Write a protein that binds this DNA or RNA. Structure first.
Ligand SMILES: Cc1cn([C@H]2CC[C@@H](COP(=O)(O)OP(=O)(O)OP(=O)(O)O)O2)c(=O)[nH]c1=O
Ligand SMILES: OC[C@H]1O[C@@](CO)(O[C@H]2O[C@H](CO)[C@@H](O)[C@H](O)[C@H]2O)[C@@H](O)[C@@H]1O
Ligand SMILES: [Mn+2]
Length: 580
DNA sequence: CCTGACTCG
DNA sequence: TGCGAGTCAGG
């Protein structure tokens, strides 16, 4: 009662059925240009293991991999597709992805390997990757016999688990979410990641040289003001300087000691001008370590491109995340940091960068879901709640509202709708707690629909134990009925936010699928490069800008039909920076 | 390896 | 005492 399989030395016709569980093993966490250590195939005819050098050089196997009519069931097909792209091979026909299936059933399980998915169905005939490859410096590919069995067992699990997972997804009304959204999206993300984004290293490097000089100046200035030399990047050392040497008041403490957070330092500005210099130093230091040095470290020298990896099965709300490098958190709020974007350029001769951003996205989604008359009316009148809130908070006229003021108001708007307390708001706007409370109270008096929705969604979560999004994404909240006030409150706030942020994620994901389809149909050369939660970034020859200015906004705005209209802002230019 | 600092949505 | 993320230097 074990698991017999074949360790083939050549490709046979039987292992090329029109349906099978396929394992194309890429052990390196970052699969870009990473080695494929082994292949496994399980179908109606049997179980097979193939060495990469064998299978990938076989004309029939390569043809099979690229045959869309030959359906494959896998785990993390994007990892396989990309790794194969780097090997010059195209993968088609992926009909089921166990990773995405597990992710949709319950994001909280943190499924990261076949074994973890299998556990959801009490399937034991497979071991966890870590148990096979090892941890850290001990991580290595085992002897062929061991490797082969593992890959085959993972293929066997995928083969036996497909039906059970599709079954539970259907019951949860998430089967289409998988097959028509996440899986198609996965292929689109694979293309985006492989294409990469070109970097102007000469300019980036020059920026780093100049930035290093500015840092040295701010650094010395800080020591001068402190009357002592110390490690500014050490909250511990900085705390001694600020709260022990300079005697500044302690406004907050964490479990390790005095807090030197940006919020605390800003509140200390009236006492000593050293805190402002420190804030500036930390800003510049981050740009240098992360957006200059860190970014240069991941640039592929030969092409000057960076290839991020969009984790599609990680966030608890359905959003994507971006790693090594994270291209979803590149500076833009402050002018100094924003310049880093001048280093992100088109990959071709006379191409340009085109960026589209959903206007007040989650407020529009909230209007729809909460069905708040006043909020829905506002969007039907095409108003800007962020600007309006800015006008009130700063007590200024619309024309006076600066981009930075709107941004601060935007943070306030979402903080309030998502349950910020009067304490939190008073601290953020450094204003009276009573006034903050009044502002919040008044805020919901104007948007009574939103208030009741938030109260109802919390009660619903307590009764059902989970919340859902527009396209049926789900998130369980077991802590929602906890005895502990803190534990419970956090769960209640998740119930308030997840459905909104999650539905916003559903929308942009559908937009990406529709756009990719529209682009291909019109044979446009324009292609997606990045997704930044509620914005899409593309590159395309200058001649296509005219079409994009209409095609991109239209597709994104028509992705889904809500009670309120969806609006998209867009721009383009020679660099990401200019796409403003 | 952990915090706490910075970055973005 | 709003939510969701990732990377870095210092300990
Ligand atoms: C910045 C920010 C954003 N979010 C969530 C919810 C909004 C989405 C999209 O961000 P965006 O700045 O475009 O917001 P949008 O409302 O789309 O603003 P624009 O009209 O696009 O400028 O991310 C948040 O929770 N807290 C924040 O401070
Ligand atoms: O291939 C991405 C996919 O793999 C998982 C593990 O199943 O994450 C791995 O790869 C990521 C990208 O390099 C790393 O950030 C992560 O540390 C590594 O375990 C999934 O989480 C992800 O969806
Ligand atoms: Mn937006």
């Amino acid at each position: 009662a074990k698991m017999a399989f074949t360790l083939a030395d050549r490709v046979t016709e039987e292992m090329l059925a029109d349906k099978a569980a396929l394992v194309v093993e890429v052990v390196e966490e970052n699969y870009h240009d990473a080695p494929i250590v082994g292949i496994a195939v399980v179908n109606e005819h049997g179980r097979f293991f193939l060495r990469p050098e064998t299978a990938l050089a076989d004309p029939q196997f390569v043809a099979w991999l690229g045959d869309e009519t030959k359906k494959k069931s896998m785990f993390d097909s994007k990892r396989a597709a990309v790794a194969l792209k780097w090997k010059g091979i195209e993968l088609c026909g992926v009909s089921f992805d166990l990773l995405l299936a597990a992710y949709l059933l319950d994001p909280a399980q943190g499924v990261d390997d076949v074994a973890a998915a299998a556990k959801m169905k009490q399937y034991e005939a497979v071991r966890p990757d870590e148990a096979v490859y090892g941890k850290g410096a001990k991580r290595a590919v085992p002897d062929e016999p061991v490797l082969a069995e593992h890959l085959v067992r993972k293929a066997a699990a995928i083969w036996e688990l497909e039906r059970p997972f599709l079954d539970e997804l259907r019951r949860n009304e998430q089967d289409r979410l998988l097959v028509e959204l996440e899986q198609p999206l996965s292929s689109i993300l694979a293309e985006m990641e492989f294409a990469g984004v070109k970097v102007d290293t000469k300019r980036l490097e020059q920026m780093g040289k100049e930035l290093a000089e500015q840092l040295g100046t701010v650094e010395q200035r800080i020591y001068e003001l402190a009357g002592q030399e110390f490690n500014i990047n050490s909250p511990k050392q900085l705390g001694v300087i600020l709260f022990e040497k300079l005697q500044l008041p302690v406004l907050k403490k964490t479990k390790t000691g005095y807090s030197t957070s940006a919020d605390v330092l800003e509140k200390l500005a009236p006492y000593h001008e050293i805190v402002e210099n420190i804030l500036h130093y930390r800003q510049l230091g981050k740009l240098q370590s992360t957006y200059i040095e860190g970014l240069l470290k991941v640039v592929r020298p030969a092409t000057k491109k960076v290839h991020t990896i969009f984790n599609q099965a990680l966030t608890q709300t359905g959003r994507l995340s971006s790693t090594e490098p994270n291209l979803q958190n590149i500076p833009i709020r402050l002018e100094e940091g924003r310049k880093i974007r001048q280093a992100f350029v088109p990959s071709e001769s006379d191409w340009l960068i085109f960026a589209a951003d959903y206007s007040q996205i989650e407020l529009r989604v909230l209007a729809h879901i909460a069905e708040d008359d006043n909020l829905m009316e506002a969007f039907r009148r095409d108003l800007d709640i962020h600007t309006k809130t800015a006008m009130d908070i700063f007590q200024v006229s619309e024309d006076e509202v600066t981009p930075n003021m709107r941004r601060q108001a935007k943070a306030v708007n979402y903080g309030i709708v998502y349950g910020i307390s009067d304490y939190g708001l008073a601290q953020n706007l450094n204003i009276s707690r009573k006034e903050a409370a009044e502002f919040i109270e008044r805020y919901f008096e104007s948007f009574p629909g939103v208030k009741r929705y938030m109260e109802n969604i919390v009660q619903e979560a307590k009764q059902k134990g989970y919340v859902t999004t527009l396209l049926h994404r789900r998130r369980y909240l077991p802590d929602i009925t906890s005895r502990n006030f803190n534990v419970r409150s956090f769960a209640e706030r998740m119930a308030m936010n997840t459905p909104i942020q999650g539905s916003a994620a559903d929308i942009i994901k559908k937009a990406m699928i529709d756009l990719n389809a529209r682009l291909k149909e019109e044979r446009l050369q324009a292609h997606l490069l990045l997704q930044v939660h509620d914005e899409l970034i593309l590159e395309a020859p200058k001649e296509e800008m005219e079409r994009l200015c209409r095609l991109v906004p239209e597709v994104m705005e028509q992705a889904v039909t809500l009670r309120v209209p969806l609006k998209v802002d867009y721009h383009y230019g020679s660099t990401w920076y200019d796409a403003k």
